[PDB]
Amino acid sequence: STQSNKKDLCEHYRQIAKESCKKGFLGVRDGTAGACFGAQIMVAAKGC
């Protein structure tokens, strides 16, 4: 409904929000810890 061609690339961007979350929590993304949601948001003002 909302996305079809803008799929996986934009999801892939939240796939990067995974490797935010497995390793480290005091300089991930310089917020500090994107941690599988503070990079899921950042997608909506980075490329997607």
From Swiss-Prot:
Keywords for the protein's UniProt record, in alphabetical order: Disulfide bond, Enterotoxin, Secreted, Signal, Toxin, Virulence
GO CC annotations, alphabetized: extracellular region
S-S bridge residues: C10-C48, C21-C36
An annotated Gene Ontology molecular function: toxin activity
Compartment(s) of residence: Secreted
Job description of the protein: Toxin which activates the particulate form of guanylate cyclase and increases cyclic GMP levels within the host intestinal epithelial cells.
Name by which UniProt lists this protein: Heat-stable enterotoxin II
Source species taxonomy: Bacteria, Pseudomonadati, Pseudomonadota, Gammaproteobacteria, Enterobacterales
Residues of the full protein shown: 24 to 71 of 71
